[PDB]
RNA sequence: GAUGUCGGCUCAUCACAUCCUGGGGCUGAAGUAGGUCCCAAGGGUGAUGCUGUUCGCCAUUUAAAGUGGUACGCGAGCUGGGUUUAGAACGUCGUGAGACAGUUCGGUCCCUAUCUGCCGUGGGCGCUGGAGAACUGAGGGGGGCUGCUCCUAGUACGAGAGGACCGGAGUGGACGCAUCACUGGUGUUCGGGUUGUCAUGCCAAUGGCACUGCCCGGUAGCUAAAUGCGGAAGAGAUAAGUGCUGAAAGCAUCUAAGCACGAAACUUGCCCCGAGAUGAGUUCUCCCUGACCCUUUAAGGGUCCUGAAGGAACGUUGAAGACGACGACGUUGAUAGGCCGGGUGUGUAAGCGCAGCGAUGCGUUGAGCUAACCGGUACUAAUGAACCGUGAGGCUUAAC
RNA sequence: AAUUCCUUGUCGGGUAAGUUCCGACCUGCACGAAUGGCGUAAUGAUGGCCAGGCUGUCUCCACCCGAGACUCAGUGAAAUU
RNA sequence: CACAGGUGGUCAGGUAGAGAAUACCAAGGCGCUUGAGAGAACUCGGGUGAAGGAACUAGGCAAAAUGGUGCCGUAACUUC
RNA sequence: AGGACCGAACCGACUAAUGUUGAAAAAUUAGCGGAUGACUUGUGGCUGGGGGUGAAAGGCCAAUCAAACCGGGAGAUAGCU
């Protein structure tokens, strides 16, 4: 139910070997406004695939 | 002898004139196209590699496409190998059809069983459940003990425990061949076979007979 | 499922009479008692119909020699020789399972006109 | 499906009215007895002047169950209650001389010809 | 196991899902564009589109059914008076779903769902 | 400065001094049966009445109901009846307070797992240019039980009762595995009835809530109680045991040379995993053959041009799945929803007419609706990018 | 017998199966008449036994519905060493 | 502790209902200071189940079952 | 009429599960007992530590009872760790 010995800092970083984050590295560019956005997501200005959809 | 690759179409019955219902599995066996022949000199053993079905030309990579082109056959949805006995021989590009099983009357059907996910010990290993009442505390379906004591001091390898169940390759042996229908590419075997509808099945003549 | 559909289609009977739950039907079944093949009649009330293509079935309930017996017939089986409706019953439900608890006057079904 | 502690009706004129299955015999750890199976029973109720007494232990054959029997067709025949016929403990032959209510085809086994002949139906 | 089952339960019981989707369908009909989580859309379609299909043909019985599914007479009126005529020749697919990022409060994936016409 | 006691439960594993099944010698072994001893652990070896009980004794099975080890296996798995706190009484003892392996009644069982151990599921690297597949089998695991009937055959035997060896064949029980044709269960996600109350202005018609209010049915999926299948035949080497030829030790003698046999053990054969099998293997196929500069010079590093096979990401998704992973699909498209047609389930919708004083009936009408099912259909969503991965792959000998 | 150790005494009843119960015998290790004896209508969240009904307690579990567990964003302990 | 615990009195609307029981509502007052997904084992709290039916267990623990009013009828025993 | 009966409030507390670093240093949920009485509740007062008070349990006396708490003697003593 609880440890018998204090785990080392080594085991801490070895468990956090898998905790690293991954960058998106794949921003798309709208063909009309030229804005960057997430692939298959509305742009911040309300475009999608070159069409004004929100305003 | 070799077998053929089909797909599980479903399951139905056949009524016999003497009033018997035979539960059958319908296996669609299209033409199996020999894509490679392996021999003792080059590959160290005797076998043929077959393909069946069709694949979208956009989904076939040029490694696979080149392998298919060497045989001169159309792309299939996969590749399977069958070990050859002493007698038979085949040639690359040959097509084998369901009337291979015309006079077989027992087959062995191999498929991937339906995946049950992470299963408990009661379902997976037929463990007995504990008391539902009479004071039982939070322990109605738990496995119970798993080892002895200090003397072993460990859990023995191969202990039965909860885990992944199903979704693995399973063979069912000695199935009656009920009907061979060459013009419809159909094989009907008596009983159930592993896998869900539409999954690949490997049919071979019975090894035990 | 087209090919299974056609396989079952080859096997269906073409002379199955129309009947509803609540009707009194008489079924002729083939009975083998050695080398002799016979027709036995089983008459009762249709209390349930499972119509599922080739796999269609219907349940007939009879009070025979003191106690109730019910048989689930496999329609399209060659064991079933012929089905004939003797009386039309008028009921509201599709499955007449409540009849199992009712006997005598309480089990009567009014005729459908 | 008849198991230990199951209560049964009596389908002959031997005198018993209610019997209880004591043992599903014919195998180790065997659980159920269907139609045509042999079971050992005790008599829980009997008529005043029958051939058997309350508390007697003897064998019986199951002739009607409300789980039913299945035919090679796939059809099923269910009854409304569970019934048996009393048999002599040593020579498995019926005690009674009349058989009440229908029986089923599975009893034709050269061992139960008396029941088939005496039965009213099937 | 969940083989071939359909319909998200959305950490809700049956009656609460039914009420929530009734309200959300009313909102989509009156406003023609609303913003919800991506999983609540893709379930709204299975509710709202059948109502438009029902509204393509106008009759007293159909209006009563629509009122039973959405207990708001304004919604029924707008359905049968505009949306049925507007989508008379459209064979299904009356809505669009557009992913629009993540919610600040809980980082839930948002989406816009709209009728494909919106009078453009 | 704490190693929880008994019994049951759930889960076990091993030993052999083997209970059953298998092999064999001796019999005071005719057969049927045995007895006794030897070999042999492959599988199997009851659920109930009383008692807290292990046990015991019963009453019925069974092929048989093995015996021990494992902290008298197992309470960070469970129970707590017993024993062993504090209340009370009885029999007994003591003047008494109190006592009693005498009895009786009632009497708080905590533990969110770090490490090893195990069951699952993934990443990172290596594997020596990368990639897509398909393989092999070196090892691991699993299974490995038995009844009854019939024929041989009333044959052999006995003297008669009784009744074989050896051969087979067919059906069971327990047990495992796949599946859902059937038959059933569940199905709050499909229809119908019905009660109270509250609304929709109201009537009708509906909805909300009362455990899905209570219910009657039921699609898919899943299931078992449903149904299919299977534990081998055969080999090889053997155990107990039996022999053949054959001296030592003219004879003899299964053993010494030499030659044969022989069991559910063993090793295979049936099934699964599997090259991190660092000892990292194999075959087929796909793709890249531009410069320049600087030096420690070395299997060196940059720069510019180039980026290929492929892979990932993202998105539509799944009889895949905790999460990864896995499988199909992205417009060259049926991958999901909707949509169309069917199926199916419920059982004759609303509205209106008619009859009846009305409740109600009837008809239009088997009508209306119908989750996940089937067959379709681009109507909606699957967007060009981009990202990663390269520019011909070390050395040495030997062949050609 | 809330007492009898022996003892699961014996016999009878109840079950197919009864160290429990109920009724006997006295063979009271070690009941006994206001530290009361013996009965007793009713009564007790009292103690022991047998019936019926009723059911997943069990044979033996199977599905459905929620709340967690799983994952994601925000916040963020403990025993222990 | 912005703690599922405790805390004297007063008022008491409608429809069903004997009722200040209980179901649904009125006036009013609230949705409980983390949410969004997936829909594993296992846990918790419920629903339903084929044949059986206490065989379970130390023991019917737990579950299920009965229930209401009028009316008819009711056993031994008794301290009436 | 009744230390009557059923049953809300109210006052209690037989059983089960759950909770056990709890929502809580004894609760929650489902049942359960009484409920015109030897009933319950409010607001004051009164009894004090070898003392009170007790329909009895070595109960209770400010989450403390084979002898409350606070301060002094007092750095009691401890062949013991």
From Swiss-Prot, chain A:
Keywords: Ribonucleoprotein, Ribosomal protein. One of its GO terms (biological process) is response to radiation. InterPro entries: Ribosomal_bL32, Ribosomal_bL32_bact, Ribosomal_zn-bd. It holds the Pfam family Ribosomal_L32p. NCBIfam families: rpmF_bact. Residues 1-37 are annotated as: Disordered. It comes from the Bacteria. Belongs to the bacterial ribosomal protein bL32 family. One of its GO terms (cellular component) is cytoplasm. This is Large ribosomal subunit protein bL32. The lineage of its organism: Bacteria, Pseudomonadati, Pseudomonadota, Gammaproteobacteria, Enterobacterales.
UniProtKB/Swiss-Prot annotation, chain B:
InterPro entries: Ribosomal_uL3 (IPR000597), Ribosomal_uL3_bac/org-type (IPR019927), Ribosomal_uL3_CS (IPR019926), Transl_B-barrel_sf (IPR009000). Methylated by PrmB. The keyword Magnesium does not apply. The modification N6-succinyllysine is found at residue 38. HAMAP family: Ribosomal_uL3_B (MF_01325_B). This is Large ribosomal subunit protein uL3. The modification N5-methylglutamine is found at residue 150. It comes from the Bacteria. The gene is rplC. One of two assembly initiator proteins, it binds directly near the 3'-end of the 23S rRNA, where it nucleates assembly of the 50S subunit. One of its GO terms (cellular component) is cytoplasm.
Curated annotation (Swiss-Prot), chain C:
The keyword Membrane does not apply. PROSITE patterns: RIBOSOMAL_L19. Induction: Part of the rpsP-rimM-trmD-rplS operon. Keywords: Ribonucleoprotein, Ribosomal protein, RNA-binding, rRNA-binding. GO terms for biological process: cytoplasmic translation; ribosomal large subunit assembly. GO terms for molecular function: large ribosomal subunit rRNA binding; structural constituent of ribosome. GO terms for cellular component: cytoplasm; cytosol; cytosolic large ribosomal subunit. Gene3D superfamilies: 2.30.30.790. It holds the Pfam family Ribosomal_L19. This protein is located at the 30S-50S ribosomal subunit interface and may play a role in the structure and function of the aminoacyl-tRNA binding site. Part of the 50S ribosomal subunit. Contacts L14. Forms two bridges to the 30S subunit in the 70S ribosome, contacting the 16S rRNA. In pre-50S ribosomal subunits interacts with RsfS, which may inhibit association with the 30S subunit. Belongs to the bacterial ribosomal protein bL19 family. This is Large ribosomal subunit protein bL19. It comes from Escherichia coli (strain K12).
From Swiss-Prot, chain E:
PROSITE patterns: RIBOSOMAL_L17. Signal peptide: none annotated. The keyword Ribosomal protein applies. GO terms for cellular component: cytoplasm; cytosol; cytosolic large ribosomal subunit. It comes from the Bacteria. Keywords: Ribonucleoprotein, Ribosomal protein. One of its GO terms (molecular function) is structural constituent of ribosome. It holds the Pfam family Ribosomal_L17. SUPFAM superfamilies: Prokaryotic ribosomal protein L17 (SSF64263). One of its GO terms (biological process) is ribosomal large subunit assembly. InterPro entries: Ribosomal_bL17, Ribosomal_bL17_CS, Ribosomal_bL17_sf. Part of the 50S ribosomal subunit. Contacts protein L32. NCBIfam families: L17. Belongs to the bacterial ribosomal protein bL17 family. Requires L15 for assembly into the 50S subunit. This is Large ribosomal subunit protein bL17. It comes from Escherichia coli (strain K12). The lineage of its organism: Bacteria, Pseudomonadati, Pseudomonadota, Gammaproteobacteria, Enterobacterales. The gene is rplQ.
